[PDB]
Amino acid sequence: QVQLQESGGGLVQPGGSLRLSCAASGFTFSNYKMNWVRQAPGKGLEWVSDISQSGASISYTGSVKGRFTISRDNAKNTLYLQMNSLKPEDTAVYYCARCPAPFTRDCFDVTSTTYAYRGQGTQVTVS
Amino acid sequence: ELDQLRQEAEQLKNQIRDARKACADATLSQITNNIDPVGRIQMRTRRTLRGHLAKIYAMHWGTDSRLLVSASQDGKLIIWDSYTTNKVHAIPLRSSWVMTCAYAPSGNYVACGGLDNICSIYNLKTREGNVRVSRELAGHTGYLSCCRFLDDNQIVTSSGDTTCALWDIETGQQTTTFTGHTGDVMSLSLAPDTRLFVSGACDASAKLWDVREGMCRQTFTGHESDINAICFFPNGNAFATGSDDATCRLFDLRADQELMTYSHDNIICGITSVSFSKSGRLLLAGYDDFNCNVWDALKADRAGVLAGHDNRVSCLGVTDDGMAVATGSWDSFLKIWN
Amino acid sequence: YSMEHFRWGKPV
Amino acid sequence: LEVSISDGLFLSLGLVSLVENALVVATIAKNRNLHSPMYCFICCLALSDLLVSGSNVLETAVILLLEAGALVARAAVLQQLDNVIDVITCSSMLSSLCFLGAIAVDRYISIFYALRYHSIVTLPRARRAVAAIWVASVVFSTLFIAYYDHVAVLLCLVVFFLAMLVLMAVLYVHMLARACQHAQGIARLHKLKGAVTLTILLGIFFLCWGPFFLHLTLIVLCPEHPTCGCIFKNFNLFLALIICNAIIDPLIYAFHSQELRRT
Amino acid sequence: LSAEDKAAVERSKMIEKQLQKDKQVYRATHRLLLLGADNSGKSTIVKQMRIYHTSGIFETKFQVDKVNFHMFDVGAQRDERRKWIQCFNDVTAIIFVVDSSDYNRLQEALNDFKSIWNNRWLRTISVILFLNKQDLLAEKVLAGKSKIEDYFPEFARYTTPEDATPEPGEDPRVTRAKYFIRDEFLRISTASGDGRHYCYPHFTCSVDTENARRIFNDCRDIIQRMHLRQYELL
Amino acid sequence: SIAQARKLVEQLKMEANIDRIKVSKAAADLMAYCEAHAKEDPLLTPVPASENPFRE
Ligand SMILES: [Ca+2]
């Protein structure tokens, strides 16, 4: 079964560093473009970062671009997000979200309010 | 708190997985090792149907499997006499963006639906010379991906609102809503008994439904991506599932699990329609490749390819007599093969 | 008599 | 002035162009998806180059076979055979020119009237235009081959070529002007293929058709001037270049489309 | 042929004639998909453009210069669009309206545009990019309360293009904001585009009477670019 | 929200307690169906042009 169990949340100080992790299972992880998405309290699903199949391409939202780094290990089936300089703006339930289809460049629906290929998510809080 | 329910759901999920693994005493690849291959199943476009202006999104054979409805996003349902390349009707739709159609097994009615959330049902046996819309089932809150008639008066309708619904057409009202899908429901196939049906969604899951009890009897979850297509095996005890993950998978109801997976590393694109042959031994998967592949449903090797289309094989239907596989495409053409 | 390889092959 | 007598080569180039046009005509007849009006005009161009190549190889065969002494014919019968071959030749030339213009017009309408294209150009009007072109090419060819001894025929046929050259150049150069304006708008938002394609469309047309209408022009202007005379004896080259048009037209108008290249 | 068989041929020929009539009506009608988030003023553009005249798809049909346009405001679908959007692989354009004012939501509009553009089936479909609500963008930049650099830090160093046209005599900073927002979607379309489809940026407000004229001009240029590529002139 | 979790839990209860046959028996039933109905499948076993309605 497709599952995106995720860990690394908690509480951090402003300026602190954190390392989210997402143990992808039930799919051929190397074939899928992987996204992070976050929901700040009462807000929508803000997309956060994107990594291509091989990791040869990455992208970020400008709120995190200089600060977070997305990475993947395709043998571990683990997606990572290091958060080197957390801010109170970053407080959200984060979610690793897979692209819908393999070998595909359009990550439709990864922010959709109900979407199947997305984790239950980790809460990040910042003092 | 919710975490307790999430943990109990994890517990039941683990229990289901363990039970499935305890039934997996064999695999169909091993059992099919003793039986001879089907060989190169070549087939030719016997008839080609030129009538549509735009891409065909859906197509469905009648019970007396000569007439063929085909639904295109120019806003036509064309009914074809496949024996003669002959249009018996052409129905102007109230919304162009049709995505599904079916015959009633009685032949009397033809349904369609699409981005407008209605299921427009058209009566072919009217006394007038042209077809009229007899009901427009309008309760869905999302596009209709597949409508299939249970009988002359009941139609079951999958929608992107994540629900299926069974309609009484005379009442025009949902008798039953099938609500368990988490994702956009993409495909619907009836069991040969019409007492059960299965629907695949944009969750990587297929669900089996009881039309009387109105309940999700089983969930099948071995796929990686959206189950664009679903088709019961003619025995009625198994069903195939085409997905964006480029794999078809055959699920047996009584084993509650994936009995076989059909895959080939040269294929990196989704399946958009699936049909079995009448014996069940051929699984016909319409790919986006834009080829159209025949699999030995038991051996799981590629028996052949229906390489006749220049755009997606959007729809694929084998006649109830098994005598031809129709294929329809975004080419606007239906090609009928045997 | 002559077969012209097409018309006007010579001034005429 | 040089010459290129090429007396037997007509049978080769005519058969080559016959095959190439037969493939295009057969392809558009086979692919019923190719009943668009543009492919209708491209089919008619191909069929016209087919009749050009066929008629040229027909009187190539007749002229060789008479020269070999393998055939004899009565003088009057031979001259009326020459008339009927030249009527179909001149007709499939006039219609080849008109179908080149008709493709240029269809393309121009498809660009400058792009949103109304299928209201303005549609398969009823495509078939009507094709009919008008073929029937007019036969009528005028019957007139031109009957009154061939009148300079007014040669001059009118040349003025028709000049009108088709002006038409081709104006339409395709204006289309290239819109192509350059689009290339500018694209570059502007982001930060010669059409000049090449234009140079093929007009250069092959003028290089291959132009010297035959020059020959006719000089017959009107100077039937006795020695340099005009040396150009006249090159007539075989100029007609063979028309046959080279019968080779190159299916390449430049049909087999640029991937849909044709598929079949 | 049998009498029933001949009669079936006669009925098929009647149907074929009607299909030929509908073919011409269909080919002369230019279909459009109107996309945009809740913020993006999509409804106001439909309502304005109707001066040129529970369900899951709203068809607004309008005419410019005797050209019929059918524009589909997709509505009351769910927010999973990856399946229904495949239908529009044969429209002339996607009118992607964007609220250019709420920079927080603008990144969502960017990812939506990127998904439309990269999609295998919309790979041939040009996008008419209506950067809407330019009045509110102007008010927001002139009030200065909100700061694009906080949402798009590359705006700290982006400089106004040489093609820029500050049409009403608007402020240089408003122009820089406008053309930056434009050039984000142009970067998406320019980088990933294959040349089979293009992005047509426009700056608009609900009050713009000319938005039908813009769509006419864009559809004209799209079909021109399509044919000019087909003729290998472009 | 809590309600969807309660629904999913009770669904997985009704789905865990279903009767399951061995995969070997499922396979054997499908294989028996294929071998029994093989002769009456015109795609698996193409019938002559005497019987084929599409190019009779
Ligand atoms: Ca002659």
β-pair partners for E203: E131
Q: Is B39 exposed, middle or buried (0-12, 13-18, 19+ CB in 10 A)?
A: exposed
What is the Cα Rg of chain D in Å? 20
Residue B233 and residue B241: Cα distance in Å, rounded? 10
Find all residues with CB under 8 Å of D26, minimum gap 6, and list them: none
Find all residues with CB under 8 Å of E14, minimum gap 6, and list them: none
Question: What is the number of other CB atoms lying within 10 angstroms of the CB of residue B193?
Answer: 10
| DSSP symbol at A77 | T
CA angle D204, D208, D210 (to 5 degrees): 105
| DSSP symbol at D68 | T
| Strand-strand pairing, A58-60 and B45-49 | unpaired
Centre of ligand 1 to C-alpha D85, Å, is 7
Q: How was this structure determined?
A: cryo-EM
Find the largest Cα–Cα distance for chain D.
Answer: 74
CA-to-CA dists, residue B269 to D100, E118, F26, angstroms: 42, 15, 29
Query: Which tokens belong to F49?
Result: 């042009």
Centre of ligand 1 to C-alpha D141, Å, is 13
Residue F31 and residue E89: Cα distance in Å, rounded? 41
Residue B141 and residue E75: Cα distance in Å, rounded? 10
Q: Which amino acid is at D146?
A: A
Q: Which amino acid is at B19?
A: A
Find all residues with CB under 8 Å of D67, minimum gap 6, and list them: none
E19 touches chain D (CB under 8 A): no
D127: chain E residues, CB-CB within 8 Å: none
Is there a contact between E234 and D257 if contact means CB atoms under 8 Å apart? no
Residue A17 and residue A28: Cα distance in Å, rounded? 30
Find all residues with CB under 8 Å of B246, minimum gap 6, and list them: A102, B263, B267, B268, B269, B270, B271, B287
A117 touches chain B (CB under 8 A): yes
Residue A8 and residue A90: Cα distance in Å, rounded? 14
Find all residues with CB under 8 Å of D80, minimum gap 6, and list them: none
Three-state DSSP state, B239: strand
**Beta carbons of D238 and D4 less than 8 angstroms apart:** no
A29: chain B residues, CB-CB within 8 Å: none
CA angle B20, B22, B24 (to 5 degrees): 70
**For chain B, the helix, strand and coil percentages under 3-state DSSP, each to the nearest 5:** 10, 45, 45
E228 touches chain D (CB under 8 A): yes
Find all residues with CB under 8 Å of D12, minimum gap 6, and list them: none
Which residues of chain F come before a gap where C and the next N are over 2.5 Å apart?
A: none
Short-list F15, A101, D242, E50, CA closest to B208: F15
Q: Which amino acid is at D53?
A: S
Number of helices (H) and strands (E) in chain C: give both, helices first: 0, 0
Short-list D246, A104, D19, A36, CA closest to E82: A104
Strand order in B164-168's β-sheet? B144-149, B154-159, B164-168, B173-178
CA-to-CA dists, residue A88 to A13, A91, A126, angstroms: 9, 6, 5
| DSSP symbol at D30 | H
**Beta carbons of E137 and E101 less than 8 angstroms apart:** yes
- Give the ranges where chain D is alpha helix by DSSP (H): 9-30, 37-67, 75-112, 117-120, 123-146, 151-190, 193-221, 226-232, 235-249, 258-261
Q: Which of E80, E122, E124, E125 to mutate against chain B (most B CBs within 10 Å)?
A: E80
Is there a contact between D239 and C4 if contact means CB atoms under 8 Å apart? no
**Beta carbons of E105 and E133 less than 8 angstroms apart:** no
What is the Cα Rg of chain F in Å? 22
F5 touches chain B (CB under 8 A): yes
**Beta carbons of E114 and E83 less than 8 angstroms apart:** no
Is there a contact between F21 and B13 if contact means CB atoms under 8 Å apart? no
Q: How far is B180 from chain A (nearest CA, A)?
A: 13
Residue E87 and residue D225: Cα distance in Å, rounded? 70
Domains and CATH numbers, chain B: 2-337 (2.130.10.10)
Residue E96 and residue E42: Cα distance in Å, rounded? 9
Tokens 């981005």 belong to which residue? B115
Chains contacting chain C through 3 or more C-beta pairs under 8 A = D
Backbone phi, psi, residue B305, to 5°: -135, 135
Q: Is the dihedral of CA A47, A49, A53, A56 positive or negative?
A: positive
Q: Which amino acid is at A23?
A: A
| The 3-state secondary structure of chain E, one letter per residue | CCHHHHHHHHHHHHHHHHHHHHHHHHHCEEEEEEECCHHHCHHHHHHHHHHHCCCCEEEEEEEECCEEEEEEEECCCCCCCCCHHHHHCCCCEEEEEEECCCHHHHHHHHHHHHHHHHCCCHHHCEEEEEEECHHHHHHHHHHCCCCHHHCCHHHHCCCCCCCCCCCCCCCHHHHHHHHHHHHHHHHHHHHHCCCCCCEEEEECCCCCCCHHHHHHHHHHHHHHHHHHHHCCCC
- Touch C-F: 3+ C-beta pairs under 8 A: no
Three-state DSSP state, D173: helix
**Beta carbons of D115 and E219 less than 8 angstroms apart:** yes
The total of structural domains in chain F comes to 1
Residue D143 and residue D146: Cα distance in Å, rounded? 5
**CA nearest to D218 within chain C:** C11
**Beta carbons of B107 and B62 less than 8 angstroms apart:** yes
Q: Which of E38, E96, E111, E120 to mutate against chain A (most A CBs within 10 Å)?
A: E111
CB pairs under 8 A between A and E: 52
**Beta carbons of B98 and B72 less than 8 angstroms apart:** yes
Q: How far is CA F24 from the centre of its chain?
A: 14
Short-list E99, E97, E138, CA closest to E116: E97
Residue B276 and residue B283: Cα distance in Å, rounded? 5
Which residues of chain B come before a gap where C and the next N are over 2.5 Å apart?
A: none
**Beta carbons of E4 and E43 less than 8 angstroms apart:** no
Residue B97 and residue B80: Cα distance in Å, rounded? 20
E154: chain A residues, CB-CB within 8 Å: 62
Residue E75 and residue E58: Cα distance in Å, rounded? 7
| The 3-state secondary structure of chain F, one letter per residue | CHHHHHHHHHHHHHHHCCCCCCHHHHHHHHHHHHHHCCCCCCCCCCCCCCCCHHHC
Domain limits of chain A?
Answer: 1-127
Centre of ligand 1 to C-alpha D68, Å, is 18
Is there a contact between D236 and C10 if contact means CB atoms under 8 Å apart? no
Range of the domain at F47: 1-56
**CA nearest to E154 within chain A:** A62
Residue D134 and residue D137: Cα distance in Å, rounded? 5
Terminus-to-terminus CA distance in chain E, angstroms?
Answer: 52
Find all residues with CB under 8 Å of E56, minimum gap 6, and list them: B114, B115, B116, B117, B118, B140, B142, B143, E74, E75, E76, E77
**CA nearest to B116 within chain E:** E56
β-pair partners for A94: A38, A122
Strand order in B215-220's β-sheet? B185-190, B196-201, B206-210, B215-220
**CA nearest to E8 within chain B:** B88
| Strand-strand pairing, B119-123 and B132-137 | antiparallel
Domains and CATH numbers, chain E: 32-221 (3.40.50.300)
CB pairs under 8 A between C and D: 52
Question: What is the number of other CB atoms lying within 10 angstroms of the CB of residue D81?
Answer: 16
Residues of chain B numbered 4-33 and touching chain F (CB < 8 Å): 5-6, 8-9, 12-13, 15-16, 19-20, 23-28, 31-32
Is there a contact between D119 and E199 if contact means CB atoms under 8 Å apart? no
H or E stretch at A90: none
Q: Which of B17, B221, B225 to mutate against chain A (most A CBs within 10 Å)?
A: B225
Q: How far is B251 from chain F (nearest CA, A)?
A: 10
Residue B200 and residue B243: Cα distance in Å, rounded? 9
Tokens 């429901």 belong to which residue? B185
Range of the domain at D108: 1-263
Query: Which tokens belong to E13?
Result: 């020929």
Centre of ligand 1 to C-alpha D133, Å, is 22
Query: Which tokens belong to E83?
Result: 């399946």
> B290 preceded by cis ω (within 30°)?
yes
Backbone phi, psi, residue D261, to 5°: -55, -30
Short-list B166, B216, B212, CA closest to B193: B212
Is there a contact between C1 and D78 if contact means CB atoms under 8 Å apart? yes
Q: Is the dihedral of CA B152, B153, B159, B162 positive or negative?
A: negative
F9 touches chain B (CB under 8 A): yes
